[PDB]
Point group: C3
Chain length 226, copies 3
């Protein structure tokens, strides 16, 4: 992939692009993304029937293709996370010793069906996921518990990010500015071939299914960028 290939499908320049602005939203339209991918790999307790959270993501992506828009949502917990991310990144740079370059949005392949937006690409070749828990409660949970208390939606997000970029290891940092001390904590998460295999199987199935459903109602993927 190039910045250039992204101009031919969407007519947006990917370098003039801030993570959170109009252009960034448009580029994700109907694309399977790392923070949402947990809904794709979600399985029922029994049977072969899509759980509801996976059907809702299905139907949310289809609506993004056919409406060309994405609803704007707002909440303190969300505005908090957006407010502190920079400092999280700066503190994580200081402590870990690695340099972070910011990445806008990375697509896995030429179909632009799948993407992630890393919180950064480190100088040692790991990517970076930053969380600034709105609740000190959840930062505390991560601080004491480490790798093992990372929710599965977050594990799905990090692994899928490795699947997309082809990388082998990922930083997972939490930052809480209200902590008097010990307000940054992080781990390194190695690429998990069991997740990788699971995305090679499920993600192409989700895609073919979205393509089935759009045809039925007379839309095509890419229509959101036309």
């Amino acid at each position: 992939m190039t910045p250039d290939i992204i101009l031919q499908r969407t007519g947006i320049d990917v370098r003039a692009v801030e993570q959170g602005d109009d252009a960034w939203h448009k580029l994700r339209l109907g694309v399977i993304t790392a923070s949402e991918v947990h809904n794709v790999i979600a399985k029922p307790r029994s049977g072969k029937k899509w759980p509801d959270m996976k059907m809702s993501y299905f139907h949310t992506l289809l609506a993004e293709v056919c409406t060309g828009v994405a609803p704007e949502v707002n909440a303190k917990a969300l505005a908090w996370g957006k407010q502190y991310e920079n400092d999280a990144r700066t503190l994580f740079e200081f402590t870990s010793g690695v340099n972070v370059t910011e990445s806008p949005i990375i697509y896995r392949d030429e179909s632009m069906r799948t993407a992630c937006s890393p919180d950064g690409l480190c100088s040692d070749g790991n990517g970076l996921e930053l969380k600034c828990p709105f609740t000190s409660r959840d930062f505390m949970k991560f601080r004491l518990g480490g790798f093992e208390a990372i929710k599965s939606a977050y594990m799905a997000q990090v692994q899928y990010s490795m699947w997309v970029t082809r990388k082998n290891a990922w930083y997972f940092a939490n930052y809480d500015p209200r902590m008097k001390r010990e307000g940054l904590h992080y781990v390194v998460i190695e690429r998990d071939e069991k997740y990788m295999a699971s995305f090679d199987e499920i993600v192409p199935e989700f895609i073919e299914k979205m393509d089935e459903a759009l045809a039925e109602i007379g839309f095509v993927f890419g229509e959101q960028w036309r």
Copy 2:
């Protein structure tokens, strides 16, 4: 049942009313309504104890009788529905050819315990449920799955509207102004005698039970209109 009788029982002239103003809310106080009737017909997995959702609509309605107020809910989804309802009606009328008269409230009988407030009545004998769902996700869900997609709580609301109005069929329609094209979808629901019989069993008993509880506390149905 007619419009003079509502004045006698409630003080409210139904003719001055349009969904969903002040008096629109008054006329519903304490009234088992189609949007909420799913709570009434909810049944436990085993046994005969009223499930929580049933007990909770019970106390809600009771609280309406005794306070004379409904707490204002769902401002966001209602402001959206009110901004689009005229285009949705218009667009349903161009598309179906059918004329739609609005209806503020229809009670089932003189007791005035039971009622629906349809989005309209159609020149061909059907009623209308016309939703502008807040999320295009929901539009999409119904646009593809059709009939079987329909919120379980919606089927109940529809049937019950036929129970209340005696009518034999009902349009169920979704409108989404955001869809680039084909943003009205609609099906026709047939009156189901299995629901009708459910209502004939469970609704009278729900009413009697509200009546005992009001007598326990020295209240009487209809006090909300005094």
Copy 3:
């Protein structure tokens, strides 16, 4: 006991009204009646701490290490603040007892365990007075009485009696929307099973917190000092 409170926090408990600023600060990382239902929850299965216990475990840990607490459930609390004085007056009128308001009461010198009564009555009973956000929940309690008071709230009342060492507590609901009969209350007697649960389980919660804090180089007390 008013003196000992200064030596830890510098705060005069006399300057203190329910909801204010100095108030919020005396509760940080303290195990409160309102939340104690999380401490005595039992697993659905196995014998590890259930999630809600862990979650409350992590919440107070964060109070200790941040020195702050978010304002949670704002609208219900604003509703309670709005009708507080009227609930009380109605309650005094109807029970015949006089209410003396009380800020925080700690169980002991440790200052690990505490409650905030809605009042202390002239008959020696404490008072929990809620103005339920929905009239629906008022209705539930009016119609159901003692046995429809939910689990979180029974534990709230009983813990209050554990902390204050009292034998009975009024549990009241007020609803100003109710056209008439908008007060309902009942008396809840000390339950020795709850006391025993608190005696076994609460100091153990406290010892895990301490251990937990040590791991990250913090100490209880640090939220104030």
